[PDB]
Amino acid sequence: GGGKTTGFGMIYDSLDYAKKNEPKHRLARHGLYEKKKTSRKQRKERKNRMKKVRGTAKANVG
Amino acid sequence: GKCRGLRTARKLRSHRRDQKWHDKQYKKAHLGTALKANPFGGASHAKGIVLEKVGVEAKQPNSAIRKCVRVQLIKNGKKITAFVPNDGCLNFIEENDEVLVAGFGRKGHAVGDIPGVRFKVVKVANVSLLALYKGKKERPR
Amino acid sequence: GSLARAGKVRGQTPKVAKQEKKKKKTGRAKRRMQYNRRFVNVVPTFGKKKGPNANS
Amino acid sequence: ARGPKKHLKRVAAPKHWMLDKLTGVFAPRPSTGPHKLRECLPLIIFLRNRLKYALTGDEVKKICMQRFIKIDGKVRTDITYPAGFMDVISIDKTGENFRLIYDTKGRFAVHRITPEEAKYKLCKVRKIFVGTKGIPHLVTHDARTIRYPDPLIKVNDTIQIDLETGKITDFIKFDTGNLCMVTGGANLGRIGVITNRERHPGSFDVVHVKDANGNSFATRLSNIFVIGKGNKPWISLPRGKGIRLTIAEERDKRLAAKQSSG
Amino acid sequence: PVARSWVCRKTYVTPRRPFEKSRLDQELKLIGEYGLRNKREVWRVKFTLAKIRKAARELLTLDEKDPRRLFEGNALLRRLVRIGVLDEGKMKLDYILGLKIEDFLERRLQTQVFKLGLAKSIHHARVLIRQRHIRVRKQVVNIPSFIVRLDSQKHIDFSLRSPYGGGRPGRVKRKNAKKG
RNA sequence: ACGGGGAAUCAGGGUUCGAUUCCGGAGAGGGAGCCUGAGAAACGGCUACCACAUCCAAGGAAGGCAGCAGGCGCGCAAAUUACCCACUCCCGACCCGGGGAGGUAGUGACGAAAAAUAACAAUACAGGACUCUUUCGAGGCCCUGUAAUUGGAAUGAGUCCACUUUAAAUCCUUUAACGAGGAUCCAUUGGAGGGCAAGUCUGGUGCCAGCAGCCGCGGUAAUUCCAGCUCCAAUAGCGUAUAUUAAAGUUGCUGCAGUUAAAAAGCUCGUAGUUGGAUCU
């Protein structure tokens, strides 16, 4: 019908408390947390490739 | 009369399961000898390959020629004469074609006029006969 | 028997084309139409001929 | 399987946790602890579901990890720690204190309690054995073992534990005329006076209980928790007084209590 | 494993004999009288009546001082008074068996929009509900088979955004005003 | 034949299904043997053998999708090599990492719920009904339409900014703007002899083609085939095939039958089974 709208809402004490106690995606809508730029399939390939390689050449791979 | 005691349930339960066997509807679905004799094996449809177009004669008080098709089934090699239903519907079929066959409707018995024919063609060449008869589609070669 | 006549009458029939008429009606307005045909303003008329699609 | 299960499906959860159908496949799976997993309320359900403090199963982690939660006076950093019957939950940042007591309908309840009462709890004695150069022990239903008990404590009685020290202060014995709560079965959460205890040697004792309205019921002996000496409960009781209303008068209470509005 | 519920229920039964005159006739009279769309809207209201008769017919074998009959039987009559099918003085469990299909079909929102005079025909009520012109107490109701309860009968009106009650005209009037 | 919880049907009794998301069992191509460990006779561990099979420089090396996707084969018969740990929870030294568990989309007429495809008004009818006229005929009083008659008023389906939703998106909900007169923005699937709702109308064919579950139809006037029109039933759904349940008191405990319709043993004795007379406050 279109007259009402229900939601939730939370009012913190400061910005550091609202930076610790808050989910990251609801801080990313305020420009305060920026997720990186990996796809999930890139990370599993890079993970399973250094499985095939011993000590310090694991940081070389990828 | 029937036995009517209070400790007679073993006489009652076991008389019935021997007397159940004289029921031909019971026996033909529980003995297993008529599902290894069924050409399908208890499927609603099956596919095959047309061997030839044999057309078979109607039964006694009414005369025509029912156009049938000799099918050889894929999944067990068995052979089957199936009836090509409407008019001009043999003219959508050539030899060595792949045909989905159904039952005729009497669950493994013949349907009146046609002698010994228990199946009917449904689809030819992966298109439907009702699509070809009514001109909705074209016969694929 | 001889398979040579197959689709004889299907191909022999004179091809008459279907005549264009209006779009019929659909749904609730169709049920209203056939209720208005049969129940309200039923005709005080030659009863016992209650055979709609009576030819003659 | 080969070795123990670590998951709990949701439909297979205890009914009294009151988890709905459509939130997930899995339920919180209580950690091993003092209580049976069918007889407990995990700390994630007390914070998220009952108290509505948290909103997800990550905020219960963020609450418990600030060490804000004491279960029986010891700080608990496991969110699936099984809190059970007569367990005291002290939250000091807000100032509340709860005790887990059953209510009349077979579930737990949010029972806020005064911090003058939160220094003690009752336990029920489960096995008494001697050993180790002749030193006697108790085992209560929380697995609390209290060596050197009073010689007049026997099985199925009730002690009163001081929660800062761990020691027994005074006890109640199993007798007739004592006030008891049923902690299991179909009469669970009901409070009445012990009328009678029928003995069945080689099987279970049946303990007939009498209400404060006259409604008699019976249980097995293991679902019996002596709360008070006489008729006076040594703990507080919930909003309902352990007295189960039939559904007719439970309807009458609603359809007469809505008429106080305006 | 999934977090889905597969609990569904069919809301109608089809008759045992498909081509039966004077079953066809009676349901067509009930389709035309109440503005319904197909037979399945009669077979649906026949089905909720057959659930109410059957549950009362079970409750009539228990005696008058049964617990279950006194509780669950008083909760069956309460709903039938609440939706306005029964009256208040007929709350024995045996005026349930005197209910009919038409008592349940008079309580739809469609016939109530027609009864209050917000429409001028029973098919004019179907469109005025379905075009979202009809609200019940605050809420635009878009479903014609919305069984109007007894307390919500005094608040049925014309939906403050609509051209009929509210006032901002529709698609057609504004274009004709543009061509003025 | 994995078993249960259960599912379909059902007056009462019953009958049949239960591979399938919950509980319990088993098994990782087929048997067998172990190591480690609290826990395994473990296969996203190892060692053999039998069966397949990959690379090879011919000396050797490595395998196990009845995990999620995907492919082939099989068949009547079944979806994407997609996104994410935000939810529900689990594992770890852990408030931080990980999870094809799981969630979200895509395909999806399995199936279940709601539900459009038009409403209204003014005319006119060689339409009906209500008051009068003996009757002709007099009326906004109520209805109807084979009016492709006129007329504005209402609206979604679409097209589409924005918000909202979400991890991020979509979808729905909310709103701009456009958006209906053969409102071509056309509703289909089966049928019209009886079972069984509904045409012995017209043209064609002439025991042919074909229809028809059953009875029957067709041999020159076909109520039944091939079609046109018209009508009927269900209606965003409707036909067909097969399994099964009711109908079936045609498996019968309730509740059938046995002279002649199918059926009482040739006769008698007899153990088990089944059933057993009065009588005690």
From Swiss-Prot, chain A:
Region: Disordered, residue numbers: 28-62
Compartments reported by the entry: Cytoplasm; Nucleus, Nucleolus
Q: Which residue stretches does the UniProt record annotate as biased composition, category Basic residues?
A: 37-55
* Tissues where the protein occurs: Mature tissues, such as adult brain, skeletal muscle, heart, and kidney, express low levels, whereas tissues and organs with significant populations of proliferating cells, such as fetal brain, placenta, bone marrow, and various glandular organs, contain significantly higher levels.
According to the entry, the disease involved is: Diamond-Blackfan anemia 3: A form of Diamond-Blackfan anemia, a congenital non-regenerative hypoplastic anemia that usually presents early in infancy. Diamond-Blackfan anemia is characterized by a moderate to severe macrocytic anemia, erythroblastopenia, and an increased risk of developing leukemia. 30 to 40% of Diamond-Blackfan anemia patients present with short stature and congenital anomalies, the most frequent being craniofacial (Pierre-Robin syndrome and cleft palate), thumb and urogenital anomalies.
This chain's function reads: Component of the small ribosomal subunit. The ribosome is a large ribonucleoprotein complex responsible for the synthesis of proteins in the cell. Required for processing of pre-rRNA and maturation of 40S ribosomal subunits. Part of the small subunit (SSU) processome, first precursor of the small eukaryotic ribosomal subunit.
The entry sums up its family as follows: Belongs to the eukaryotic ribosomal protein eS24 family.
Of the intact sequence, the residues represented are 65 to 126 of 133
Curated annotation (Swiss-Prot), chain C:
Q: Provide the positions where the record notes the PTM N6-succinyllysine.
A: K48
Question: What is the annotated localization of this protein?
Answer: Cytoplasm; Nucleus
Q: Which residues form a coiled coil?
A: none
Disordered: region residues:
7-33
Q: Where in the sequence does UniProt note compositional bias of the Basic residues kind?
A: 20-33
State the function annotated in the UniProt record.
Component of the 40S subunit of the ribosome. Contributes to the assembly and function of 40S ribosomal subunits.
Q: How does it assemble?
A: Component of the 40S subunit of the ribosome.
Full protein name: Small ribosomal subunit protein eS30
Q: Which residues of the full protein are shown?
A: 78 to 133 of 133
Swiss-Prot record, chain D:
What is one cellular component GO term in this UniProt entry?
Answer: cytoplasmic ribonucleoprotein granule
Which InterPro entries does the record associate with it? KOW (IPR005824), Rib_uL2_dom2 (IPR014722), Ribosomal_eS4 (IPR000876), Ribosomal_eS4_C (IPR032277), Ribosomal_eS4_central_region (IPR013845), Ribosomal_eS4_central_sf (IPR038237), Ribosomal_eS4_KOW (IPR041982), Ribosomal_eS4_N (IPR013843)
Molecular function (GO) terms for this protein are: RNA binding; rRNA binding; structural constituent of ribosome
Q: Which PROSITE patterns match?
A: RIBOSOMAL_S4E, S4
Subcellular location, principal = cytoplasm
Tell me which UniProt keywords the record has, alphabetically.
Acetylation, Cytoplasm, Isopeptide bond, Nucleus, Ribonucleoprotein, Ribosomal protein, RNA-binding, rRNA-binding, Ubl conjugation
What is this protein called in UniProt?
A: Small ribosomal subunit protein eS4, X isoform
State the family it belongs to. Answer: Belongs to the eukaryotic ribosomal protein eS4 family.
Keyword GTP-binding attached: no
Site of covalent link Glycyl lysine isopeptide (Lys-Gly) (interchain with G-Cter in SUMO2): K229
**Example GO BP:** ribosomal small subunit biogenesis
**Annotated gene:** RPS4X
Residues the record lists as N6-acetyllysine modifications: K232
Free-text function comment from the UniProt entry: Component of the small ribosomal subunit. The ribosome is a large ribonucleoprotein complex responsible for the synthesis of proteins in the cell. Part of the small subunit (SSU) processome, first precursor of the small eukaryotic ribosomal subunit. During the assembly of the SSU processome in the nucleolus, many ribosome biogenesis factors, an RNA chaperone and ribosomal proteins associate with the nascent pre-rRNA and work in concert to generate RNA folding, modifications, rearrangements and cleavage as well as targeted degradation of pre-ribosomal RNA by the RNA exosome.
Claim: Ribosomal protein is one of the keywords in the record: yes
Domain S4 RNA-binding: where?
A: 41-103
Tell me where on the tree of life, at the top rank, the source sits. Answer: Eukaryota
UniProtKB/Swiss-Prot annotation, chain E:
This protein's major location comes to cytoplasm
Gene3D superfamilies cross-referenced by the UniProt entry: RNA-binding S4 domain (3.10.290.10)
Phosphoserine modification sites are S152, S162
Q: Where is the S4 RNA-binding domain?
A: 107-180
Query: Which GO cellular component terms, listed alphabetically, does the Swiss-Prot or TrEMBL entry include?
Result: cytoplasm; cytosol; cytosolic ribosome; cytosolic small ribosomal subunit; extracellular exosome; focal adhesion; membrane; nucleolus
Q: Name one GO molecular function term.
A: structural constituent of ribosome
Where is the region Disordered? 161-180
- Residue(s) of cross-link: Glycyl lysine isopeptide (Lys-Gly) (interchain with G-Cter in SUMO2): K92, K138
Which of UniProt's keywords are assigned here? Acetylation, Cytoplasm, Isopeptide bond, Nucleus, Phosphoprotein, Ribonucleoprotein, Ribosomal protein, RNA-binding, rRNA-binding, Ubl conjugation
Entries under SMART domains matching the protein: Ribosomal_S4, S4
| Database matches in Pfam families | Ribosomal_S4, S4
Biological process GO terms, please?
A: cytoplasmic translation; positive regulation of cell population proliferation; ribosomal small subunit biogenesis; translation
Q: Where in the cell is it found?
A: Cytoplasm; Nucleus, Nucleolus
Tell me the subunit arrangement. Answer: Component of the small ribosomal subunit. Identified in a IGF2BP1-dependent mRNP granule complex containing untranslated mRNAs. Part of the small subunit (SSU) processome, composed of more than 70 proteins and the RNA chaperone small nucleolar RNA (snoRNA) U3.
Q: Which PANTHER family match?
A: 30S 40S RIBOSOMAL PROTEIN, SMALL RIBOSOMAL SUBUNIT PROTEIN US4
Please report which protein family the annotation says this sequence is part of. Belongs to the universal ribosomal protein uS4 family.
> Which protein, by its recorded name, is this?
Small ribosomal subunit protein uS4
This chain's source organism reads Homo sapiens
What taxonomic classification does the UniProt entry list for its organism? Eukaryota, Metazoa, Chordata, Craniata, Vertebrata
Which gene name belongs to this protein?
Answer: RPS9
